[PDB]
Design an enzyme around this catalytic site. Structure first.
Site, mmCIF file in Angstrom:
data_model
loop_
_atom_site.group_PDB
_atom_site.id
_atom_site.type_symbol
_atom_site.label_atom_id
_atom_site.label_comp_id
_atom_site.label_asym_id
_atom_site.label_seq_id
_atom_site.Cartn_x
_atom_site.Cartn_y
_atom_site.Cartn_z
ATOM 1 N N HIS A 192 0.812 -1.214 0.000
ATOM 2 C CA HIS A 192 0.000 0.000 0.000
ATOM 3 C C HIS A 192 0.854 1.276 0.000
ATOM 4 O O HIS A 192 0.290 2.361 0.010
ATOM 5 C CB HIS A 192 -1.022 0.009 1.157
ATOM 6 N N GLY A 205 3.091 5.912 9.421
ATOM 7 C CA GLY A 205 4.480 5.845 9.045
ATOM 8 C C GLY A 205 5.236 4.668 9.632
ATOM 9 O O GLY A 205 6.340 4.364 9.159
ATOM 10 N N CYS A 254 4.231 1.640 9.311
ATOM 11 C CA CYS A 254 4.040 0.522 8.395
ATOM 12 C C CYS A 254 5.362 0.012 7.842
ATOM 13 O O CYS A 254 6.273 0.789 7.544
ATOM 14 C CB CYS A 254 3.099 0.934 7.267
HETATM 15 O O1 LIG Z 1 -3.960 1.684 9.177
HETATM 16 C C1 LIG Z 1 -3.400 2.265 8.309
HETATM 17 C C2 LIG Z 1 -1.902 2.509 8.437
HETATM 18 C C3 LIG Z 1 -1.507 2.630 9.904
HETATM 19 C C4 LIG Z 1 -1.707 3.821 10.585
HETATM 20 C C5 LIG Z 1 -1.341 3.888 11.917
HETATM 21 C C6 LIG Z 1 -0.798 2.761 12.517
HETATM 22 N N1 LIG Z 1 -0.624 1.639 11.836
HETATM 23 C C7 LIG Z 1 -0.956 1.545 10.567
HETATM 24 N N2 LIG Z 1 -4.160 2.725 7.154
HETATM 25 C C8 LIG Z 1 -5.582 2.466 7.097
HETATM 26 C C9 LIG Z 1 -5.825 1.029 6.651
HETATM 27 C C10 LIG Z 1 -7.103 0.517 6.772
HETATM 28 C C11 LIG Z 1 -7.380 -0.781 6.384
HETATM 29 C C12 LIG Z 1 -6.373 -1.568 5.862
HETATM 30 C C13 LIG Z 1 -5.081 -1.064 5.743
HETATM 31 CL CL1 LIG Z 1 -3.806 -2.148 5.101
HETATM 32 C C14 LIG Z 1 -4.799 0.245 6.136
HETATM 33 C C15 LIG Z 1 -3.595 3.442 6.025
HETATM 34 C C16 LIG Z 1 -2.703 2.820 5.177
HETATM 35 C C17 LIG Z 1 -2.196 3.516 4.095
HETATM 36 C C18 LIG Z 1 -2.598 4.820 3.844
HETATM 37 C C19 LIG Z 1 -2.006 5.570 2.650
HETATM 38 C C20 LIG Z 1 -1.677 6.918 2.619
HETATM 39 N N3 LIG Z 1 -1.168 7.169 1.405
HETATM 40 N N4 LIG Z 1 -1.176 5.994 0.701
HETATM 41 C C21 LIG Z 1 -1.671 5.029 1.436
HETATM 42 C C22 LIG Z 1 -3.501 5.443 4.687
HETATM 43 C C23 LIG Z 1 -4.002 4.745 5.772
#
Ligand SMILES: O=C(Cc1cccnc1)N(Cc1cccc(Cl)c1)c1ccc(-c2cn[nH]c2)cc1
Ligand SMILES: O=C(Cc1cccnc1)N(Cc1cccc(Cl)c1)c1ccc(-c2cn[nH]c2)cc1
Lengths: 302, 302
Positions: free
Chosen positions: A41, A143, A145
């Site tokens: 992602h 961040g 991730c």
């Molecule tokens: O959760 C997260 C990441 C996260 C945040 C805080 C702590 N840990 C992880 N998300 C929400 C989410 C929802 C459902 C499935 C997943 Cl895989 C991820 C998240 C991931 C990527 C982006 C993104 C921004 N630009 N491009 C892509 C935005 C949100």
């Protein structure tokens, strides 16, 4: 003596953390030999995350769109592929600090160290467990991730986890290093359900053994019980049914402390039915299920 | 989100852990530049430890009696001195992996990471706090002596602790890196008394702020109190008296959460007087005092 939630020493893994940037998005990646692993992602824009077609998004992408930075050394990307939910970025230089490593998919209940990272730099380290419902309870900000979890055997890092997402419930989910999610989770920002999270019964028993070894003996009692009747109690209290394999694994702890497993089970029954009435066990007012039998053996012999 | 007892990444310190052997005794040592620091009771025999005359024992010793091994590279010892309760072994080769470092004597209540080691090899890493009574509650088996505690600022390791002894009470005591014990302790195997250990009140308040940030708001109440009256309660419950400095340090947490410090104090009062009635705060059934305001700020912003 003493007993602590202990993580593995993180240096071998520190030397592998890189930063990966695709357009606006930046997250962490794992540089082993000449391959960098990170969550796919990274190729999404913030709006893309509700219904992303990863194949189509990856197609708009070429090698040079992937900015990979190790400290300040920039890595040249020579190939890119999607394996399940991870991106494999083939780079031109093998990581000189690649440790001996393996990818392993761990079993619910087993534990591992997490090295939380931002912008490819390590923030901190902590131990955590794959819960029966395949979530983990960690500390992950945006961040973080691509931060990884691992065990260290001997001279060998066994990577088992890469962090992908925070659930609306505030717990955390991710993949193995082949990109297969642990659990039913998908990398789409839709609301998703972690099932009932039961307690890891064998881990609680190992913790009680650790507590006995370290002076805390107040929960030891004059009873015993049976696997079946104990398990009836376990089911009442959302504990994992205990099996003969679990009993065998507690063998060495039983032998070193001279306490039969089923006796410890009767103690645990008593705690489950009558609470702790305000005392503590190894410093905690709750039953702890994030130490494995192996964790206890490791910490109690060095 | 999420909140965890997080240690610093341990690699910079891993590269400094060595093994030090004097006759039969072996423990850990800290190799920075061309000096190796370790506990002076390495020069004692097991019987020597009840009434050791360290000067006389050191006098029977010459440079070549000190076997210093870094992994397998053997270090040649060119000088030796006793500074308080540490031995400073001057060696011929500067540690190539010496990080930027400082020695600091920390204040009770502050926290640090410990890298538990045996035979000069790192076992694991965990966070802990200098208690008001200058003990620490850790995980230390025989041979873990000389394991060090540290913080990491920016690019700089601040070593603050070297482990020397387990008290008969099962908690742990040691020195700064100049060899001065924290607390009234001496390196003789006599029974020694750690005083009353009070709770680090400012740390508990920072933890409550962290809990609020992360969804746990059930302890927030409609009261407030005053510094003096809160402190009366604190004294009833063996908590450290709270001061205006403590209040100021909680400033940023107050501002980010929009909760006045004295209101959080009233919540804490209520918890102290009425317990937790079986609920939990950030996963714990007890009040946690081993996070500093700085720890919370660090973890809640990356
Ligand atoms: O959760 C997260 C990441 C996260 C945040 C805080 C702590 N840990 C992880 N998300 C929400 C989410 C929802 C459902 C499935 C997943 Cl895989 C991820 C998240 C991931 C990527 C982006 C993104 C921004 N630009 N491009 C892509 C935005 C949100
Ligand atoms: O506690 C410890 C060390 C320890 C053990 C487990 C965990 N942590 C620390 N002692 C007891 C003790 C009592 C009072 C003061 C101190 Cl300084 C140490 C200890 C230290 C050295 C030796 C020794 C053996 N050969 N030569 C010297 C023997 C015992």
């Amino acid at each position: 003596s003493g007993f602590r939630k202990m993580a593995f020493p993180s240096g071998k893994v520190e030397g592998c953390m890189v930063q990966v940037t695709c357009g606006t998005t930046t997250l962490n990646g794992l540089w082993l030999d000449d391959v960098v692993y990170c969550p796919r992602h990274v190729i999404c824009t913030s709006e893309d995350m509700l219904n992303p077609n990863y194949e189509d998004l990856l197609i708009r992408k070429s090698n040079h769109n992937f900015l990979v930075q190790a400290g300040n050394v920039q890595l040249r990307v020579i190939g890119h592929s999607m394996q399940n939910c991870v991106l494999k970025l083939k780079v031109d230089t093998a990581n000189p600090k690649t440790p001996k490593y393996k990818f392993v998919r761990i079993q619910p209940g087993q534990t591992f160290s997490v090295l939380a990272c931002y912008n490819g730099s390590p923030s901190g380290v902590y131990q955590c467990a794959m819960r029966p419902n395949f979530t983990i309870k960690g500390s992950f900000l945006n961040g973080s991730c691509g931060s990884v979890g691992f065990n260290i055997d001997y001279d060998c890092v066994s990577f088992c986890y890469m962090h992908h997402m925070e659930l609306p419930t505030g717990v955390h989910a991710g993949t193995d290093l082949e990109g297969n999610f642990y659990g039913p989770f998908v990398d789409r920002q839709t609301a998703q359900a972690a099932g009932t999270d039961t307690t890891i019964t064998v881990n609680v028993l190992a913790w009680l053994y650790a507590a006995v070894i370290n002076g805390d003996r107040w929960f030891l009692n004059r009873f015993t019980t049976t696997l079946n009747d104990f398990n009836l109690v376990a089911m009442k209290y959302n504990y994992e049914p205990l099996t003969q394999d679990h009993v065998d694994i507690l063998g060495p702890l039983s032998a070193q402390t001279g306490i039969a497993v089923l006796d410890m089970c009767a103690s645990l029954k008593e705690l489950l039915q009558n609470g702790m009435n305000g005392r503590t066990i190894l410093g905690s007012a709750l039953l702890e299920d994030e130490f494995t039998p192996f964790d206890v053996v490791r910490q109690c012999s060095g």
